């Protein structure tokens, strides 16, 4: 019955190649990339209401 | 007749390759994966209902609306007396990053940040106001403004 | 729950569960029904809301396991919309919530 256990280990590694920790890794990397993409170069203009 | 027994054993192993224990194993693994996928990175923004006083005099900084991706932030516009101030019109710059819902009669705008960190601005022309109300919408902050009561300087049609 | 609409008060949290119906009835401070003028559901792919347009009762079924969001409920006599945060997959499931709004 050890064949069943090791087949289940291989099966669960193949079905979910990203660990629950690696999923939060990937989510954080994605959010960091989006933050870098959406960051304005230099200082954003000061919003002023002039007359 | 032992052939029948062992054939049934191989049979029932092939029909249900996942044991009743391994089925709960797989279900727990799936739920853990879904929890990891749906978990937000870092601290979720604090849901706050804030109140601001909109000063329309030149030199004053337009009010900031803290949004969050996929969350509804509602701005209600009130005059200095706290009475509702209906919205004549609005103008949304960069409407690909914010979605605004507003029935044309009321004074409440409901903005949902479609993008994570892309910020913009918004113009709100009220009923009795010649001067439009200018706001800056910034998503992805440590606070999410569920509701903002914008106390515009003027006196609205409700006294 | 008692809904406090004063600024600085935390919006009420509704504990949901995937595939389960959670019904919010909105009541005023006197406990009487407070009919719903309209509602606005952010992220409607994770929550399904059923509401006949006359009553004061909303039925959310959490479509997704742990994806949480928020919801705005504009009542009849209220200028200030009621803001709630809907969180599924908790250790409690709110079958019904009695929301005592301030007005």
């Amino acid at each position: 019955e050890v064949i069943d256990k090791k087949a289940f280990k291989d099966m669960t590694r193949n079905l979910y190649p990203l660990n629950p920790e690696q999923v939060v890794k990937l989510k954080q990397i994605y959010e960091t990339s989006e933050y870098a993409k959406a960051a304005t170069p230099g200082t954003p203009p000061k919003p002023t209401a002039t007359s | 007749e032992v052939i029948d027994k062992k054939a049934f054993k191989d049979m029932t192993r092939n029909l249900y390759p996942l044991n009743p224990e391994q089925v709960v194993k797989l279900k727990q693994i799936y739920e853990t994966s879904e929890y990891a996928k749906a978990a937000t990175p870092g601290t979720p923004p604090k849901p706050t209902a804030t109140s601001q006083f909109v000063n329309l005099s030149p030199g004053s900084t337009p009010p900031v609306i803290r949004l969050s991706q996929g969350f509804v932030s509602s701005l209600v516009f009130l005059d200095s007396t706290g009475a509702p101030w209906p919205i004549a019109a609005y103008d949304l710059g960069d409407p690909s990053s914010f979605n605004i819902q507003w029935d044309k009669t009321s004074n409440t705008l409901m903005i949902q940040a479609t993008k994570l960190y892309n910020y913009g601005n918004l113009a709100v022309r009220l009923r009795g106001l010649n001067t439009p109300v200018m706001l800056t919408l910034i998503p992805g902050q440590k606070a999410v403004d569920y509701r903002v009561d914008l106390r515009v300087q003027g006196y609205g049609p409700n006294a | 729950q008692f809904v406090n609409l004063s600024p600085g008060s935390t919006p009420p949290v509704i504990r949901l569960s995937q595939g389960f119906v959670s019904s919010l009835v909105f009541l005023d401070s006197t406990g009487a029904p407070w009919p719903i003028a309209a509602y606005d559901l952010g992220d409607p792919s994770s929550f399904n809301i059923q509401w006949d347009k006359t009553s004061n009762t909303l039925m959310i079924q959490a479509t997704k396991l742990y994806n949480y969001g928020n919801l705005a409920v504009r009542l009849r006599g209220l200028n200030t919309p009621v803001m709630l945060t809907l969180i599924p997959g908790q250790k409690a499931v709110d079958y019904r919530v009695d929301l005592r709004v301030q007005g």
Binding site: I3, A7, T12, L15 | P17, L18, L26 | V21, T63
Partner: protein, 34 residues
Amino acid sequence: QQEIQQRTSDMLTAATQLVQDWKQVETQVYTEGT
């Protein structure tokens, strides 16, 4: 040795179907009276 890959394949076919079944959620139905 090859029986291990065969078993893993069978259980992966079972597991994909099981996960697909778990992902399904039927939306609530509201039935108004007469």
